[PDB]
């Protein structure tokens, strides 16, 4: 019945007291957090409260679109020794920090992912060379599907792979993907091992990395420049902005205190000092 945009509990007028009631007294040993409102420890006037928790609702908290990855590609000359660089990226929020930390306050979740692609470009050589408006392809290769080998192989024919042809200089590309989780909720943390070391086997064959799983495996993105080789090398960056929408979460955890190090819960040394100096008896 209570929604987000509802007014918080109205403060009630309270006066002098001398009773067998003990609001102020608790014992945090019970695990229970003592619920004390204003009209308890002090005499408060009647206040028709107006503040609402609207903007603090789960949906609202993650209501921004974060930068998950930067993918580099180019379009080098037909005469270059190197191959036309096409980008491949493992789909994950973890690569950066921000979006990750926010997703860390909870143990689990369900959310339809909405993606954004703000592509940029530029020349590289000190040549007054020309380049026509470039076309971009964003290709979603699910787990175990043909990942491209060249910038021009049968794979990009994508008879079944959902791709996005972006024409540079237009309103950024966008797609929506629902809950593709193999579970019931995507596990931001996972206490375990994909394999179980066995006894009539060898340490090699039953060794697995702690913390990982297939849960957080969804596929990779492959981006290229659909235009062929051009007389002037034109590099390009693909920024991916992800925004969780229609979100739910389960069981809170404390936010990441120290600086990140890897996709694991691991921490590097020298970054173990989160706080600063401040006296106990000084304001």
């Amino acid at each position, epitope marked *: 019945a209570a929604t987000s945009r509802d007014a918080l509990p109205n403060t009630e007028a309270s006066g002098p007291t001398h009773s067998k009631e003990i609001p102020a007294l608790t014992a945090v040993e019970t695990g229970a957090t003592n619920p004390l409102v204003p009209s308890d420890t002090v005499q408060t006037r009647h206040v028709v409260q107006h503040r609402s928790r609207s903007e603090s609702s789960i949906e609202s908290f993650f209501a921004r679109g974060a930068c998950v990855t930067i993918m580099t590609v180019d379009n080098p000359a037909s005469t270059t020794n190197k191959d036309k660089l096409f980008a491949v990226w493992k789909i994950t929020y973890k690569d950066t920090v921000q979006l990750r930390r926010k997703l860390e306050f909870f143990t689990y979740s369900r959310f339809d992912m909405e993606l954004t692609f703000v592509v940029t470009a530029n020349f590289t050589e000190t040549n007054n060379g020309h380049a026509l408006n470039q076309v971009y392809q964003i290709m979603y290769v699910p787990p175990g599907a043909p990942v491209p080998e060249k910038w021009d192989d049968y794979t990009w024919q994508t008879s079944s792979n959902p791709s996005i042809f972006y024409t540079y200089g237009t309103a950024p590309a966008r797609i929506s993907v629902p809950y593709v989780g193999i579970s019931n909720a995507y596990s931001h943390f996972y206490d375990g091992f994909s*394999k179980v070391p066995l006894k009539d086997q060898s340490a090699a064959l039953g060794d697995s990395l702690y913390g990982a799983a297939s849960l957080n495996d969804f596929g990779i993105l492959a981006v290229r420049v659909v235009n062929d080789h051009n007389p002037t090398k034109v590099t390009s960056k693909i920024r991916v902005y992800l925004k969780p929408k229609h979100i739910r979460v389960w069981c809170p955890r404390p936010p990441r205190a120290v600086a990140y190090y890897g996709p694991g819960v691991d921490y590097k040394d020298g970054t173990l000092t989160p706080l600063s100096t401040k006296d106990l008896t000084t304001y």
Partner: nanobody
Amino acid sequence: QVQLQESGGGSVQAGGSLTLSCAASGITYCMGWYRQVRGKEREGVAFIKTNDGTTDYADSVKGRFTISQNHATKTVYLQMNSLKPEDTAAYYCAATWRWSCPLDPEGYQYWGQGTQVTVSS
């Protein structure tokens, strides 16, 4: 489009141990499946999955080598122990996202420059 680099390789005696480092460009493990293929020419040693576990070693080296993943630095190593003269080979590192093909040298797409290791008798 990752770029490999073979570092931490050199001369040592017989019986000892040496470590090999393989840092990579990107967006590294994103091309997935890192490997260690020795031989003066071409022959595998270690194979590894960027996700999950997921080790496996060449029968010829089994139980003396280990390939590890440092996703933070983007470096894949290779701890070679109890070295023996037959270990003096041309070491390299590899990758292909294709979650399979670890038994074919020509199945790859990525290769580094290399580092000669010498197990001096």
